[PDB]
């Protein structure tokens, strides 16, 4: 078979988190990125 879209198109690589829009997970990421 294949992947189903996962009602959003912008899923995290590291959490559950996903967003409509590019921008608004690349400001997520950035969380992960900082969290130290
Ligand atoms: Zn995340």
Redesign the pocket.
């Known amino acids: 078979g294949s992947s189903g879209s996962s009602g959003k198109p912008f899923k ?6 996903a967003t409509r829009s590019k921008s608004n997970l690349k400001a ?2 950035n ?2 990125s900082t969290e130290k």
């Open positions: 995290c690589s590291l959490c559950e988190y997520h990421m969380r992960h």
